[PDB]
């Protein structure tokens, strides 16, 4: 089998992407944030504290003839950005772009933190990291991809995120028309539960490539590119008027400035992030100070190849017995 779904930015900055997902019978369609940095499929629901729901579409398990309580199961998650949610669990039928999994764990939120409530466009998350990170207790549950894997034509999914435009998540096949050149594959460590890999280096604009190992995660659920402070400083030093602002919480720059591209290495191959992809607009409405899309990972504890980086590439998440990651230009 295969599936193919369009993913759409939630706003004009590509702060996140939402993909429609069918849950239950008859189908209830919710717009979920596909997140290769976590492993829970959780939704706003009829069980979510009323005061914490503000415009989201909810899953109502009592209206699904295929929903079954996963008796005794609870879940609770906290994300790198400080947000969180928790609740109980049903199993139900879940379809993404034509690909159907029966018996998928659908984690129903009883509580969500303010950032989730405040984002009307995201009805929940669909985790695509390794199932070892799933938070359901007492019986850890499998991701949508893990459940689908054996039925897929090939045990892969791909992320093709757009810049200020829709893109595509495919399951079970590689669309050879969606990228230019070849796909370069690189080793993955699953030891922390992430799609963790090692970039071979970077360049800033037309500058010479610096060969240096940068361990990080391919994370569709993180907006920006977070790299070591040395790398990030080298980038922003090439932008007139850029500075790190402790009050704002990262590098800012005047929008009158031209942003150089940023290149990262995948083996001997190179992915070029155009300068425009690094502009996240005014820090506040009307401000001449713009927020940068490359920021320091210092104190995150891990480097994160988030949407800024991934949307510059066609990315293969290869879930073969020994997982790997593939990157192509596009």
Strand order in the sheet with 269-273: 269-273, 262-266, 196-204, 210-218, 303-305, 225-227, 294-296
Q: Say how far apart CA 52 and CA 118 lie, in whole Å.
A: 9
Structural domains in the chain, sorted by start: 5-174 (2.40.70.10), 175-330 (2.40.70.10)
Three-class HEC string of 218-274? ECCCCCCEEECHHHHHHHHCCCCCCEEECCCCEEEEECCCCCCCEEEEECCEEEEEC
Burial of 251 (0-12, 13-18, 19+ CB in 10 A): buried
Peptide bond between residue 252 and the one before it cis (omega within 30 degrees of 0): no
Burial of 270 (0-12, 13-18, 19+ CB in 10 A): middle
Q: Say how far apart CA 22 and CA 26 lie, in whole Å.
A: 9
Tracing tokens 């071979």 back to the chain, one arrives at: 200
Burial of 181 (0-12, 13-18, 19+ CB in 10 A): exposed
The answer to whether the CB of 211 falls within 8 A of the CB of 200 is: yes
CA distances from 196 to 75, 191, 288, 305 (A): 24, 8, 36, 10
CB atoms closer than 10 angstroms to residue 146: 19
Q: Which residues contact 199 (CB under 8 A, 6 or more apart)?
A: 213, 214, 215, 216, 264, 265, 266, 305
Resolution of the model in angstroms = 1.4
Tracing tokens 């050879």 back to the chain, one arrives at: 176
Catalytically active residues are: 35, 199
Q: Say how far apart CA 125 and CA 32 lie, in whole Å.
A: 5
Q: Say how far apart CA 125 and CA 266 lie, in whole Å.
A: 28
Tracing tokens 């009829």 back to the chain, one arrives at: 46
Tracing tokens 């759409």 back to the chain, one arrives at: 8
């Amino acid at each position: 089998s295969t599936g193919s779904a369009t993913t759409t930015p939630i706003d004009s900055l590509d702060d996140a992407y939402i993909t429609p997902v069918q849950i239950g019978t008859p189908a209830q369609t919710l717009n979920l944030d596909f997140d290769t940095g976590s492993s829970d499929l959780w939704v706003f629901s009829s069980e979510t504290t009323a005061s914490e729901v503000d415009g989201q579409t909810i899953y109502t398990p009592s209206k699904s003839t295929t929903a079954k309580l996963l008796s005794g199961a609870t879940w609770s998650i906290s994300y790198g950005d400080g947000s969180s949610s928790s609740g109980d669990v049903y199993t139900d039928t879940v379809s993404v772009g034509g690909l159907t999994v029966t018996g998928q764990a659908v984690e129903s939120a009883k509580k969500v933190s303010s950032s989730f409530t405040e984002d009307s466009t995201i009805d929940g998350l669909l985790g695509l990291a390794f199932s070892t990170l799933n938070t359901v207790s007492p019986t850890q549950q499998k991701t949508f991809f893990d459940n689908a894997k054996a039925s897929l034509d090939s045990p892969v999914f791909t992320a093709d995120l757009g810049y200020h435009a829709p893109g595509t998540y495919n399951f079970g096949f590689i669309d050879t028309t969606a990228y230019t050149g070849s796909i370069t594959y690189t080793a993955v460590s699953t030891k922390q539960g992430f799609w963790e890999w090692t970039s071979t280096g970077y360049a800033v604009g037309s500058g010479t490539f610096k060969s240096t190992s940068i361990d990080g995660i391919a994370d569709t659920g993180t907006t920006l590119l977070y790299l070591p402070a040395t790398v990030v400083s080298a980038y922003w030093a090439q932008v007139s008027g850029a500075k790190s602002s402790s009050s704002v919480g990262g590098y800012v720059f005047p929008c009158s400035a031209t942003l150089p591209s940023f290149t990262f290495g995948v083996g001997s191959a190179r992915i070029v992030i155009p300068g425009d992809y690094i502009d996240f607009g005014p820090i506040s409405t009307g401000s001449s100070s713009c927020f940068g899309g490359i920021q320091s990972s210092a104190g995150i504890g891990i480097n994160i190849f988030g949407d800024v980086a991934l949307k510059a590439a066609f990315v293969v998440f290869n879930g073969a017995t020994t997982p790997t990651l593939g990157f192509a230009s596009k």
